[PDB]
Amino acid sequence: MALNFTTITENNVIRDLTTQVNNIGEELTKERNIFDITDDLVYNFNKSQKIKLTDDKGLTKSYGNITALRDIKEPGYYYIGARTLATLLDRPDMESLDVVLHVVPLDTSSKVVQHLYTLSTNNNQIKMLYRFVSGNSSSEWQFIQGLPSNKNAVISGTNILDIASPGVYFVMGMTGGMPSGVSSGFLDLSVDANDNRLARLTDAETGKEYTSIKKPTGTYTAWKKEFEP
Amino acid sequence: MALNFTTITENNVIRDLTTQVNNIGEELTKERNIFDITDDLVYNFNKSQKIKLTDDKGLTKSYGNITALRDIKEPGYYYIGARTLATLLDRPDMESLDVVLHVVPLDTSSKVVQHLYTLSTNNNQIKMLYRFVSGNSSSEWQFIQGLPSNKNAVISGTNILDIASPGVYFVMGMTGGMPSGVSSGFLDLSVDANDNRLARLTDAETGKEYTSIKKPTGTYTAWKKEFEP
Amino acid sequence: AIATYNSHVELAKYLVSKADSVYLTIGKSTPWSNETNPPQPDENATVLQEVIGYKKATKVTLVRPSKSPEDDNKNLISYGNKSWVEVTPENAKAEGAKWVYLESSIVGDELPLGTYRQVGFVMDLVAKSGISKFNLVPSEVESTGTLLFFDNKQFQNRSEQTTAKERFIVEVDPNS
Amino acid sequence: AIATYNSHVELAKYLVSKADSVYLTIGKSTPWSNETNPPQPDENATVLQEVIGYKKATKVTLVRPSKSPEDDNKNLISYGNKSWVEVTPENAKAEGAKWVYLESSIVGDELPLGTYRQVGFVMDLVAKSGISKFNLVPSEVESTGTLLFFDNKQFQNRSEQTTAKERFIVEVDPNS
């Protein structure tokens, strides 16, 4: 949009003044003029998503000063770098694995659902998690397992007892902990809040079950086999 | 932005009319005039999120009368209190709780994916559910299993046979239904769309297993112990 | 082998379903070799010469030539010394409507002024930079889509007052 | 005003995009008045006479006449006294492929045995609810779609042994 206007001097006849008034009135009245476009813009803007869920590039929102992940209650996607920062106390219970936080909006700004997924470098370690937050309070984190490539994960190069997460794996090339002659299996591990445990290992070579339990001792029991002739 | 203008009366000479026309012309033709700023706004608003996922503060949107969760077909966040949820004809079969509904857009408006997050500071109530919807039809609500604090959940103070949800728990302080001579254990439970059941319980002390089954129109059987010498 | 009349009818219902992607285009602002007698149009062409701009199709519809008495009470259009009637997609085989009417009006200066000789209609046209408007100069077209139909006219002129309404009536097989 | 050669390419791509809905059809199981010379066909038809049935197309493709040496390592077809090459949809305008090749084959008694004299192809054919078999007698069809192309031929008989191949090469406008 643009007016063509020339400044009118003492020498100009009433025709020239008339030309400029016509130029002004035409630009201001032409179909879909400045007025129509601005009334359309307002009507659009009242409908609009008047708050950011992403930055101006489509990237994560940054945030203010914090002490806990529940401090972020504005809706959006948020992300963290340095281990120097990533120290905070209301994080989920697993090692330093770095994250994106999504904050889901509810009825009130004091309450949100928080969703967590892991980052920085490498492959396997990730989880998905969620929780509900209200004022300062919350649920504990709820952890979701997922089958990589529609298959049970393969764990190798570790002692089978040092795995703490519940769930089903295929285990082979374990550096230790296994029953005699048992090289590999499915492992189904169960663990509670007291640190009771129930490990079921099944030997993939034969179909023999070996079960061992951990009490607050720190030690798993011997390998209780299934029964045989 | 603002024009400087003085109304011209029949007593004003042509010079006065010339001065006002020059004022109008200059304001409408200066650098960053009203036209340029409006062309900036159009070029920006065309790129925005043009309808609401949230209200203008970030909170859940408003919705009109629904009989069923399938009735909400706009993308966005909506709050649904427990008293409302209990009345919705396509609700999930659970204890009634406050929830947010998040709605995911598809190829069409007549179809949506729906995510429901339960809003409770109790880890035993907090759950995730989702489904696909088409017209009046849908899949069932898919319940998704998870580990509170990365552990198997802890249940207590109940008859064990009243526990119905498939999964793995630690069960302790159980009032009744347990195998004889057992006082706590890992419970593995499976239950189907016909109300067949399998419960495999292991005694936390000995590592003996016990199995019980329920037929569609029965209670459980007693606990069938593992094979012993 | 051969196509059929009703094949052409259903193909016309397909081109009418595309209508929103349809734009007038004008070009050839400099002379032919003879200005009274242009060269005949080459259907291997992909864009007009010396392109002046594009304008969205202000009308696209099925039509047919009008017939009496049964059209005497209908939606008549007048074009190129002939009288035509509008038809709707779900009736096209009952009426025998295999013809598509295509039209756009360039009001005054909403494309740059001066003479033009070529007139064409393109489908699948996509503009640059999120632009909403229905009048485009070449520097605001991203993909020209497909030049469906065109003609090599004598010149004409355009001024601030004069609307240039350009239009065609066409079928998918005019002549087998 | 005229359609262009690349319009006929796009309209051929449109037909070949419809391939999944394409069926061979056969009919005219009783004699012509003259069996040595079938009557020339009528483009106002909507179906075959004395229809025996429908078979899903085995081959819908764009084609053009071949050209050596560059086509010598493309898919050649011998039909109607001439050599042809297939063309794929994403290469149609690079090749000039305004012809369509249609073929199906009926394996033995998968339609009731006898003779046929008409041959045709339909697009947008739909069978009755839950039928999945590619052979349909007329009473198993729900919607016959649109009869695109057909011919009147001398009779062919069918028996359990014989796999009845039938085919066309066509263009959306054969006379321009």
mmCIF file of C-alpha atoms in Angstrom, chain C residues 20-173:
data_model
loop_
_atom_site.group_PDB
_atom_site.id
_atom_site.type_symbol
_atom_site.label_atom_id
_atom_site.label_comp_id
_atom_site.label_asym_id
_atom_site.label_seq_id
_atom_site.Cartn_x
_atom_site.Cartn_y
_atom_site.Cartn_z
ATOM 1 C CA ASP C 20 -8.957 -22.750 -7.042
ATOM 2 C CA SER C 21 -5.441 -23.426 -8.478
ATOM 3 C CA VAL C 22 -6.520 -21.723 -11.804
ATOM 4 C CA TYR C 23 -5.188 -18.263 -12.932
ATOM 5 C CA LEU C 24 -5.459 -16.104 -16.033
ATOM 6 C CA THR C 25 -2.027 -15.066 -17.354
ATOM 7 C CA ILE C 26 -1.256 -12.236 -19.822
ATOM 8 C CA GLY C 27 1.923 -11.592 -21.817
ATOM 9 C CA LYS C 28 3.571 -10.513 -25.096
ATOM 10 C CA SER C 29 3.705 -6.743 -24.320
ATOM 11 C CA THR C 30 6.047 -6.089 -27.367
ATOM 12 C CA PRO C 31 4.858 -6.591 -31.036
ATOM 13 C CA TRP C 32 4.456 -9.666 -33.204
ATOM 14 C CA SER C 33 5.938 -9.441 -36.753
ATOM 15 C CA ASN C 34 2.383 -8.630 -37.984
ATOM 16 C CA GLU C 35 0.131 -7.124 -35.242
ATOM 17 C CA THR C 36 -3.142 -7.782 -37.190
ATOM 18 C CA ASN C 37 -2.018 -11.449 -37.803
ATOM 19 C CA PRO C 38 -0.275 -13.178 -34.745
ATOM 20 C CA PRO C 39 1.507 -16.612 -35.096
ATOM 21 C CA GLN C 40 -0.746 -19.667 -34.251
ATOM 22 C CA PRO C 41 -0.264 -20.967 -30.630
ATOM 23 C CA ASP C 42 2.184 -23.839 -29.967
ATOM 24 C CA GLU C 43 0.845 -26.407 -27.473
ATOM 25 C CA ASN C 44 4.392 -27.530 -26.498
ATOM 26 C CA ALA C 45 4.784 -24.126 -24.759
ATOM 27 C CA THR C 46 4.942 -24.033 -20.950
ATOM 28 C CA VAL C 47 4.574 -20.266 -20.196
ATOM 29 C CA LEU C 48 3.525 -17.121 -22.125
ATOM 30 C CA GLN C 49 6.152 -14.816 -23.705
ATOM 31 C CA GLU C 50 7.060 -11.489 -21.931
ATOM 32 C CA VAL C 51 4.786 -12.344 -18.951
ATOM 33 C CA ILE C 52 2.894 -9.283 -17.499
ATOM 34 C CA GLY C 53 1.238 -11.239 -14.654
ATOM 35 C CA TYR C 54 -1.305 -13.777 -13.418
ATOM 36 C CA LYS C 55 -4.854 -13.262 -12.048
ATOM 37 C CA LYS C 56 -6.934 -15.924 -10.173
ATOM 38 C CA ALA C 57 -9.905 -17.368 -12.088
ATOM 39 C CA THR C 58 -12.876 -15.244 -10.951
ATOM 40 C CA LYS C 59 -15.049 -17.983 -12.507
ATOM 41 C CA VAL C 60 -14.593 -21.687 -13.359
ATOM 42 C CA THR C 61 -17.644 -23.896 -14.150
ATOM 43 C CA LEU C 62 -19.042 -26.557 -16.422
ATOM 44 C CA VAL C 63 -21.099 -25.037 -19.281
ATOM 45 C CA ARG C 64 -22.621 -26.034 -22.601
ATOM 46 C CA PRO C 65 -23.938 -24.138 -25.648
ATOM 47 C CA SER C 66 -27.546 -23.079 -24.925
ATOM 48 C CA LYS C 67 -30.522 -24.919 -26.569
ATOM 49 C CA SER C 68 -34.202 -23.822 -26.866
ATOM 50 C CA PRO C 69 -36.843 -24.087 -25.458
ATOM 51 C CA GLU C 70 -35.305 -26.043 -22.504
ATOM 52 C CA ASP C 71 -32.629 -23.357 -21.602
ATOM 53 C CA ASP C 72 -34.897 -20.317 -22.121
ATOM 54 C CA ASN C 73 -35.436 -20.026 -18.300
ATOM 55 C CA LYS C 74 -31.725 -20.830 -17.211
ATOM 56 C CA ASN C 75 -28.368 -19.174 -16.125
ATOM 57 C CA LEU C 76 -27.229 -17.777 -19.530
ATOM 58 C CA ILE C 77 -23.682 -16.414 -20.214
ATOM 59 C CA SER C 78 -22.711 -14.443 -23.386
ATOM 60 C CA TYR C 79 -19.239 -15.108 -24.930
ATOM 61 C CA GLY C 80 -17.549 -14.630 -28.327
ATOM 62 C CA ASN C 81 -20.826 -14.003 -30.247
ATOM 63 C CA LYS C 82 -22.434 -17.229 -28.668
ATOM 64 C CA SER C 83 -24.880 -17.936 -25.770
ATOM 65 C CA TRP C 84 -23.944 -20.522 -23.091
ATOM 66 C CA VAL C 85 -25.508 -22.022 -19.914
ATOM 67 C CA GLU C 86 -23.884 -23.019 -16.561
ATOM 68 C CA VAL C 87 -23.965 -26.740 -15.452
ATOM 69 C CA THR C 88 -23.186 -28.426 -12.048
ATOM 70 C CA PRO C 89 -20.772 -31.384 -11.461
ATOM 71 C CA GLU C 90 -23.412 -33.961 -10.342
ATOM 72 C CA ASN C 91 -25.544 -33.214 -13.508
ATOM 73 C CA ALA C 92 -22.756 -33.098 -16.131
ATOM 74 C CA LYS C 93 -23.679 -36.457 -17.870
ATOM 75 C CA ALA C 94 -27.442 -35.623 -17.915
ATOM 76 C CA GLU C 95 -26.803 -32.231 -19.640
ATOM 77 C CA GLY C 96 -23.814 -33.475 -21.739
ATOM 78 C CA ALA C 97 -21.613 -30.653 -20.303
ATOM 79 C CA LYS C 98 -17.996 -31.343 -21.349
ATOM 80 C CA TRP C 99 -17.090 -27.621 -21.652
ATOM 81 C CA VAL C 100 -15.319 -25.601 -18.977
ATOM 82 C CA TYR C 101 -15.857 -21.831 -18.723
ATOM 83 C CA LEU C 102 -12.732 -19.984 -17.430
ATOM 84 C CA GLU C 103 -12.648 -16.209 -16.672
ATOM 85 C CA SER C 104 -10.670 -13.472 -14.942
ATOM 86 C CA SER C 105 -10.905 -9.644 -14.962
ATOM 87 C CA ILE C 106 -7.797 -7.486 -14.600
ATOM 88 C CA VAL C 107 -9.339 -4.277 -13.110
ATOM 89 C CA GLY C 108 -7.440 -1.177 -14.272
ATOM 90 C CA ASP C 109 -3.842 -1.163 -13.016
ATOM 91 C CA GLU C 110 -3.977 -4.236 -10.634
ATOM 92 C CA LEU C 111 -1.375 -5.623 -13.024
ATOM 93 C CA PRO C 112 1.174 -3.163 -14.606
ATOM 94 C CA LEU C 113 -0.410 -1.090 -17.442
ATOM 95 C CA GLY C 114 0.460 -1.202 -21.192
ATOM 96 C CA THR C 115 -0.362 -3.559 -24.071
ATOM 97 C CA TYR C 116 -0.723 -7.393 -24.033
ATOM 98 C CA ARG C 117 -1.209 -9.976 -26.860
ATOM 99 C CA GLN C 118 -1.137 -13.418 -25.166
ATOM 100 C CA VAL C 119 -3.945 -14.730 -22.948
ATOM 101 C CA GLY C 120 -3.639 -18.070 -21.093
ATOM 102 C CA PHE C 121 -4.978 -20.028 -18.121
ATOM 103 C CA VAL C 122 -2.695 -22.025 -15.793
ATOM 104 C CA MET C 123 -3.673 -24.595 -13.080
ATOM 105 C CA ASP C 124 -1.562 -25.700 -10.045
ATOM 106 C CA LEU C 125 -0.052 -22.195 -9.796
ATOM 107 C CA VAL C 126 1.657 -21.508 -6.387
ATOM 108 C CA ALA C 127 2.752 -18.026 -5.308
ATOM 109 C CA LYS C 128 5.878 -16.966 -3.231
ATOM 110 C CA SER C 129 6.292 -15.870 0.402
ATOM 111 C CA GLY C 130 2.838 -16.816 1.828
ATOM 112 C CA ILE C 131 1.135 -14.171 -0.437
ATOM 113 C CA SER C 132 -2.706 -14.083 -0.334
ATOM 114 C CA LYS C 133 -3.550 -11.836 -3.305
ATOM 115 C CA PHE C 134 -5.083 -13.002 -6.594
ATOM 116 C CA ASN C 135 -3.058 -10.653 -8.886
ATOM 117 C CA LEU C 136 0.625 -11.752 -9.234
ATOM 118 C CA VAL C 137 3.567 -10.346 -11.196
ATOM 119 C CA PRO C 138 6.236 -12.947 -12.261
ATOM 120 C CA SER C 139 8.504 -11.987 -9.270
ATOM 121 C CA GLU C 140 5.704 -13.288 -6.939
ATOM 122 C CA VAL C 141 5.171 -16.738 -8.663
ATOM 123 C CA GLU C 142 7.033 -19.763 -7.170
ATOM 124 C CA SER C 143 5.612 -22.592 -9.315
ATOM 125 C CA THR C 144 3.726 -21.790 -12.491
ATOM 126 C CA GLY C 145 2.007 -25.244 -12.231
ATOM 127 C CA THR C 146 0.678 -26.060 -15.746
ATOM 128 C CA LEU C 147 -0.335 -23.840 -18.699
ATOM 129 C CA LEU C 148 -3.646 -25.618 -19.617
ATOM 130 C CA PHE C 149 -5.107 -23.341 -22.364
ATOM 131 C CA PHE C 150 -3.876 -20.242 -24.298
ATOM 132 C CA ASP C 151 -4.315 -18.044 -27.405
ATOM 133 C CA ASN C 152 -2.131 -15.554 -29.431
ATOM 134 C CA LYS C 153 -4.449 -12.501 -29.917
ATOM 135 C CA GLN C 154 -3.844 -9.114 -31.518
ATOM 136 C CA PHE C 155 -2.629 -6.491 -29.056
ATOM 137 C CA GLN C 156 -4.917 -4.618 -26.668
ATOM 138 C CA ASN C 157 -4.271 -1.679 -24.259
ATOM 139 C CA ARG C 158 -5.086 -1.273 -20.528
ATOM 140 C CA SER C 159 -5.575 2.001 -18.628
ATOM 141 C CA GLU C 160 -6.569 2.875 -14.993
ATOM 142 C CA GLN C 161 -10.314 2.901 -15.839
ATOM 143 C CA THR C 162 -10.589 -0.094 -18.275
ATOM 144 C CA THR C 163 -11.167 -3.556 -16.850
ATOM 145 C CA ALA C 164 -9.566 -6.332 -18.995
ATOM 146 C CA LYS C 165 -11.963 -9.303 -18.660
ATOM 147 C CA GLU C 166 -10.263 -12.279 -20.384
ATOM 148 C CA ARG C 167 -11.997 -15.667 -20.634
ATOM 149 C CA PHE C 168 -12.320 -18.961 -22.531
ATOM 150 C CA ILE C 169 -14.748 -21.818 -23.100
ATOM 151 C CA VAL C 170 -12.874 -25.144 -23.655
ATOM 152 C CA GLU C 171 -13.221 -28.959 -23.669
ATOM 153 C CA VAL C 172 -10.597 -31.775 -23.119
ATOM 154 C CA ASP C 173 -10.990 -33.021 -26.702
#
